[PDB]
Amino acid sequence: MFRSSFCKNLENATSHLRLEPDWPSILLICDEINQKDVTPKNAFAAIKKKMNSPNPHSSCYSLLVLESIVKNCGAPVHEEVFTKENCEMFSSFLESTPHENVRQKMLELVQTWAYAFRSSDKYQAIKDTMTILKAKGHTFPELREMFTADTAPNWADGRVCHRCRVEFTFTNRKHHCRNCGQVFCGQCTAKQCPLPKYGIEKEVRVCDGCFAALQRG
Amino acid sequence: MFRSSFCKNLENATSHLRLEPDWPSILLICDEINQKDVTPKNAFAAIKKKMNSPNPHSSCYSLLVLESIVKNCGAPVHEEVFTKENCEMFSSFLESTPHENVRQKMLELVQTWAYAFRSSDKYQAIKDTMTILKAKGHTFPELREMFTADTAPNWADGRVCHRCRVEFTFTNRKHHCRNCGQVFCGQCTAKQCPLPKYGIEKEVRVCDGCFAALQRG
Ligand SMILES: [Zn+2]
Ligand SMILES: [Zn+2]
Ligand SMILES: [Zn+2]
Ligand SMILES: [Zn+2]
Structure with a gap:
């Protein structure tokens, strides 16, 4: 039983x-x-x-x-x-x-x-x-890729948004994408979605590149 | 005017x-x-x-x-x-x-x-x-401390919770404290508060050490 x-x-x-x-x-x-x-x-x-x-x-x-x-x-x-x-x-x-x-x-x-x-x-x-x-x-x-375990990538820092390169200011501040760990401006991470493979069921902030990639695979 | x-x-x-x-x-x-x-x-x-x-x-x-x-x-x-x-x-x-x-x-x-x-x-x-x-x-x-600008610290990674040292698992996963950037288990970051000096007005996740320090200064 x-x-x-x-x-x-x-x-x-x-x-x-x-x-x-x-x-x-x-x-x-x-x-x-x-x-x-x-x-x-x-x-x-x-x-x-x-x-x-x-x-x-x-x-x-x-x-x-x-x-x-x-x-x-x-x-x-x-x-x-x-x-x-x-x-x-x-x-x-x-x-x-x-x-x-x-x-x-x-x-x-x-x-x-x-x-x-x-x-x-x-x-x-x-x-x-x-x-x-x-x-x-x-x-x-079709081939896509060793493999890395299901675990959220570390969170990088930087002085410009990873995607659009705008320079962060005290008002246009950084935000991390929970899927790739890079820092982006708010307009490049205005969408969200769950990342259940990382144990995250609620919708969290992601960057445009990741939101597109997640939408595919 | x-x-x-x-x-x-x-x-x-x-x-x-x-x-x-x-x-x-x-x-x-x-x-x-x-x-x-x-x-x-x-x-x-x-x-x-x-x-x-x-x-x-x-x-x-x-x-x-x-x-x-x-x-x-x-x-x-x-x-x-x-x-x-x-x-x-x-x-x-x-x-x-x-x-x-x-x-x-x-x-x-x-x-x-x-x-x-x-x-x-x-x-x-x-x-x-x-x-x-x-x-x-x-x-x-009383003295407390050069100084670093008002900007959120970078986000570290690690395999154990910074505070209690419990080992992260796929179910007991990491979370970053938005005040110090370290990774902690959910029980060491179960409180939240705003960090207006970093431009964050909404209450966000912080670790116990930071919640205590923020409560003081
Ligand atoms: Zn951007
Ligand atoms: Zn991303
Ligand atoms: Zn802990
Ligand atoms: Zn902290």
Whole structure:
């Protein structure tokens, strides 16, 4: 039964009822692994079962959970995850799933991971799985990028607005964008939005460049 | 008549009706000088007249305006202000004003300025005026500190809360104090207040140490 806190958070995070990711539960999962409440092995096995959920949304969401722990939980997770069998499993998985949305997300992760651990000795079964998949006829998504954990960038300072370069005065003062951490004038940071991946659910101040980029990805 | 924008801002800032400083008008005065809308000479002369206001509040407020331009407007103001006569004037001024609140504020500024320009060749008529005032029997306020302009400190990063040292997690994330720029956990920055000297009138997040220090000074 719900028993471990981890399992309740995974149920929550992979629930077909959510219309957008449940970042709060996903961030809780990352902390539980990082703090040793649950082992990388047990987490990954529970994740696999959710990957095999008959629901397309639950199945794809579990892939998002997977992307997050690989990104936020370090070597303990990387070693559990990127093995020969698992990379091959990832392969058969994406090749036989009835949901294309699921297959596309897995293809993207394989490639993201191939480039992320490109300079790492320990991992490469990933780079090859892509070789075989790119050789087997599978087409990969557009590349976007190692990766940095889900954490708000540090906040820079400066004497001019990063975007428009206007010089700050005592009246036209600086403001930080919560997504990139740079300083901007108020007119270049007049919009706001949530940054749930950084644990921020409320709408906070962001710069124009970030508001545009967030609107895309 | 109100004619120059500067004069309207000085009237506003030294108005006996204000119960707390009018930081927005004071910051406007600093920008007007910095941007050359008004010369250091004309500003200082208009300030002197307000220093000689028969109202104790207007008179003391004009001293606050003076502290601000010396602090936020650099050498153009320092040279206009710290001359032999002006330092001597400051002296006779504080010695003959009917309001003690006015005399105390001037004594504090003289000392602040003596220590602020302590390593500057150009200024010293200030250090001596204090000599004479400390030699003439006048007692000076408690020392608190050059000085840094009214501008929000840069925002540091870190992996532990600056105050309590708790380790940030994905759920117990960082927050910056708007007064000192350090990162803290939410429980060490659960209070807020305005920072009108930085041009921030609304109540913003501050750390416990700053909330205590702001409550004093
Ligand atoms: Zn700008
Ligand atoms: Zn930004
Ligand atoms: Zn703390
Ligand atoms: Zn602080």
